[PDB]
Design a binder for this molecule. Sequence first.
Ligand SMILES: [Cl-]
Ligand SMILES: [Cl-]
Ligand SMILES: [Cl-]
Ligand SMILES: [Cl-]
Ligand SMILES: [Cl-]
Ligand SMILES: [Cl-]
Ligand SMILES: [Cl-]
Ligand SMILES: [Cl-]
Ligand SMILES: [Cl-]
Ligand SMILES: [Cl-]
Ligand SMILES: [Cl-]
Ligand SMILES: [Cl-]
Ligand SMILES: [Mg+2]
Ligand SMILES: [Mg+2]
Ligand SMILES: [Mg+2]
Ligand SMILES: [Mg+2]
Ligand SMILES: [Mg+2]
Ligand SMILES: [Mg+2]
Ligand SMILES: [Mg+2]
Ligand SMILES: [Mg+2]
Ligand SMILES: [Mg+2]
Ligand SMILES: [Mg+2]
Ligand code: NA
Ligand SMILES: [Zn+2]
Ligand SMILES: [Zn+2]
Ligand SMILES: [Zn+2]
Ligand SMILES: [Zn+2]
Lengths: 430, 430
Amino acid sequence: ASPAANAIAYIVDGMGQTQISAARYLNAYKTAPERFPLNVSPAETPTGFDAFSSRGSMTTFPDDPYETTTDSAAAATAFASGVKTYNGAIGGVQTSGGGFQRVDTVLERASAQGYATGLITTTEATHATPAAFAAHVEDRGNQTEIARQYIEETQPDVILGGQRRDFEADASNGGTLVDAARDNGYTIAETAAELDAVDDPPVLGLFSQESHLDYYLDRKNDPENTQPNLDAMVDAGVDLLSSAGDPDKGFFLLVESGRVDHAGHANYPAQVAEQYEATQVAGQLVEYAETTAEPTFLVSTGDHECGGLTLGRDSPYEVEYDVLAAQKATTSRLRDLLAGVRSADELESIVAAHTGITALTDREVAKLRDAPGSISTILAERAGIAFTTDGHTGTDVPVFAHGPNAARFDAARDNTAVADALAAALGVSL
Amino acid sequence: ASPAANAIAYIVDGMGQTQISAARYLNAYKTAPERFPLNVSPAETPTGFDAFSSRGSMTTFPDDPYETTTDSAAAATAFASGVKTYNGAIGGVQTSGGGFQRVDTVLERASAQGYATGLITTTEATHATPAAFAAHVEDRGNQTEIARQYIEETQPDVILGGQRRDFEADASNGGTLVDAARDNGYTIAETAAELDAVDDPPVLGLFSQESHLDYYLDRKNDPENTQPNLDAMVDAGVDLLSSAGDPDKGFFLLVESGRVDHAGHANYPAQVAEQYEATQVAGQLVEYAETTAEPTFLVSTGDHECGGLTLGRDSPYEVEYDVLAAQKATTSRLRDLLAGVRSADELESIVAAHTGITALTDREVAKLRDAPGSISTILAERAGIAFTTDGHTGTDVPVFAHGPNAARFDAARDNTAVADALAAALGVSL
Ligand SMILES: [Cl-]
Ligand SMILES: [Cl-]
Ligand SMILES: [Cl-]
Ligand SMILES: [Cl-]
Ligand SMILES: [Cl-]
Ligand SMILES: [Cl-]
Ligand SMILES: [Cl-]
Ligand SMILES: [Cl-]
Ligand SMILES: [Cl-]
Ligand SMILES: [Cl-]
Ligand SMILES: [Cl-]
Ligand SMILES: [Cl-]
Ligand SMILES: [Mg+2]
Ligand SMILES: [Mg+2]
Ligand SMILES: [Mg+2]
Ligand SMILES: [Mg+2]
Ligand SMILES: [Mg+2]
Ligand SMILES: [Mg+2]
Ligand SMILES: [Mg+2]
Ligand SMILES: [Mg+2]
Ligand SMILES: [Mg+2]
Ligand SMILES: [Mg+2]
Ligand code: NA
Ligand SMILES: [Zn+2]
Ligand SMILES: [Zn+2]
Ligand SMILES: [Zn+2]
Ligand SMILES: [Zn+2]
C-alpha cells in the first residue's frame, strides 16, 4: 500500500508569510485583548498552521515568456502536475515542437487508482486553482470548457464552489451541464441548507449564480447570506468522500480558500479576516488527519502573495488590531450599504453598525459620501497596514505538511514539489 | 558534555521572508541570466539558508507599553536572555516592583563556563544587537556605557564592528577605553589589513571612526574602502575563538549582518544586495559547522522585517532583477558621487559607471541634479520593487537552525526560543 489512504492539498490563494502573521495577531487579539500581544507567542496560542508538523518555504515563479511572478493557473498546474508552465495555462504546457500539450494531474491519477476525489473552493468552481486539478485548457478564461471537462471527463465526486452560470452552458448532448451532471448521478446544492440535505455523493455545489462566494466577513455577518462557510464545505466534503471499503484507498481532496487573493487585489483590509478563516480551516484539516484510521497526508501553501501587504504603514511601530477585529463587513458589502447615503449621521450610523468605528471625521464623511469604496483606505489607515500593489508579488511563501513523509518539507522546495509529494503519498505515477 | 562545543547566533537585522526571497532571485540571476528564473528553484540553485537543516517561523513582538512592533534592542534581549522586554532595553527588563533589572545573557553564562566568546557586526560595535549579548543598559542610546561594559566587565575575546568614537570615552581609570582594552591584552585593528595581521586574541576591531561599516556594495566596489567584509570578519573571528584545549568548550559567537535594516529604513534598493551578502555568510557558517571536530549548533533569524519591502510595485507581475544585479554603488555612495554635478552628460556618466543604467531620461537628470538621493527611488522604480514604511513591520520572520537539536526549530517559535536553544546547546543555565 502507499504511505497514505487520504491526501489533501490545501491552497490559500494569495497567502504569504505576512498574511499568515496578520491573522496570527488578529487571533491573539480576539482571544485575549488584555494579554495582547504577549499571547501571540506560538507557545501560548497555537494557530491552525502551527498544528502542522513540518514547514518550509516554496518558490512560486512560472515558466512565462514575460512575467517573473506567477498567476494562479501556472502555480496550480505546478501543484497538480509537477511542471512549470506559462501564466494562464491550466493543466498543460506550451511545447516548442507541438503547441499546447496536456499534462496529467494528481487528481486524475488518484481517480484511476480508485481514490474518491474532490474540489472545494470559495471562488467560482471553474477558477484557475481547482481547474488545474481537473481540466486542461490553453487559457484559464475558458470557464465553460473547464466546466464541461469537470462534468463530462474528469467527474470529481465532490465539486463545491461558486458560479452556476458556467454549468448552464451547453453539454455535448441534451441540455446544460447541470443536466449532464444530474444524468451522471450528481445532486445539485445551491445553499448551505441544501448542502446539509445531500444524502449521497456525487455532489455539485454551486453557491452563487455568478462570480465567487462572498468574503468570510460577509458570509458570517450578513443575515441574508445562504452560502456555506469553508469549514462546513470541508466537513460535508470529507464525509462524502470517505466510505467503508478501501482501507488503503481513501480520497484525494483539493481545498482552496481563494479570496485572500481577491482582497489583496482590491487592497481590502478584510484580507486579514479572510486569512483568519483560512488558518482556522488549516487547523480543522490537521484535526481530521489525526483522527483517520489510515494515514492522511496534508500539504498546504499559498500559490503566491497578493497585494504586497505589510504590517506597518509609513513610519510607526504599531498596528491597530482592534480595527480589524471589530470589522463585521468587508468594503464590498459596505459599498452596497452606503450607496446613495448623503447624511453624515446616517453614514456614521451605518459604519458604526458594521465596524468598531464610533465617530467619523468630517473628512471621512466626505470620502464615503463621494465614494463608499474609499472605506477600504479609511480602514487600512486606521489599522496601520499597507499594500504596495494591486497585483501579485514574487516572494517565496510558506509550505506546511503533515502525515507520512511530512519532514521532506522542512526545506526550501519548488512549487512543483507539491505534486510529487501528493503522488508519493497516494502511490501514483505523475 | 553539552550537545555542542560551539554555538553561533547569526542575526540579520531587518530580514524577513521577502528580503530572503529577493536575494534568492538576485543570486539566481547573477549565476545564469539565460536560465533565469527557472534556476531559482532550490533544487537547482541552493542558497546559504537552504544549507540549514531546519527552518521555522518566529514571532518578534516586544513587551512594550505602546509599540506592537519590536526594535532591535528588545529583540536581541530576547535572543540573548530569553525574556521579552520594552523597545530600547538592552540586557534587562522593567519590573513593576523595582525599575530596570539586569538579566543574564547566554554570552556571559558561556564565558563563565570557559567558552571563548565573540561579537562580530557590520554596525557600530555598541549598537543594540551585539550590546544585548554583552551589556546592560536601560536605554540603547547609552553607547559609551555599553563600550565600558564590553571592555571592563564582559570582555568578549573578539569584538568586531564600527565606531571607534565610543571607545574613546573615559575608562574608569587612566585613559580611554581603547587604553583599557590594550591594558587587558586586546590588539586594536582599524582596517582589513590590520585585522589580517592580528596574531593572537583578544581583538577589538573598530573599522570606522564614527557610525557603521559601509554597505556591502560600497565595501566591495569603492577602491578607497579599507574595511573587511563580513565573510572575512567571520573567518578571522572563528580562527581566533577556536584553539586546542576543550574539546567540549569551543566558543559562543554572535554574528550580525546589521545593515539590511538600515537599507530598509532608507528605502534603498541595495537592501537586496546587502541581504545577498548576508545569505552568503549564512552558507559560510553552515560550511564551518560541518567541518568542526566537535558539534556546532547554529541558529539564524531576523530580529524583525524592515521597510515593508515587496517584490512588485503598483501592478505588474514582473521584477527587473538586472537593475539590482548591475548596481555597484548604494544610494549613500551615489549621493557623494553626484553631489554638485549639474551637467546631464556628467550625471549620466557617473550613473553609468556605477549601475546598469546606460541612458537617463531628462526627468531623471532633473531629479538627480536637484537631489542625488532621489536615485534610490529611480532605482526602486526601474527594479519594480516597493517599500511601505521607513520603520519596522510586525511580520513573523524565518528562523534557521543546524546541528544538534536543530529540528526543534521545524516549528513556529517565539524569539525567546533562540536564547533557550543556545543555552541548551552550550549546556548553561539561562
Ligand atoms: Cl494504496
Ligand atoms: Cl477533454
Ligand atoms: Cl438536484
Ligand atoms: Cl475591507
Ligand atoms: Cl479606529
Ligand atoms: Cl524541490
Ligand atoms: Cl560541555
Ligand atoms: Cl556593570
Ligand atoms: Cl594595538
Ligand atoms: Cl540603494
Ligand atoms: Cl533599467
Ligand atoms: Cl517557543
Ligand atoms: Mg493508499
Ligand atoms: Mg485561486
Ligand atoms: Mg462518509
Ligand atoms: Mg520614521
Ligand atoms: Mg496603538
Ligand atoms: Mg560543550
Ligand atoms: Mg542590529
Ligand atoms: Mg584558531
Ligand atoms: Mg493591476
Ligand atoms: Mg521585465
Ligand atoms: Na521546517
Ligand atoms: Zn493566486
Ligand atoms: Zn490574484
Ligand atoms: Zn533591527
Ligand atoms: Zn531598524
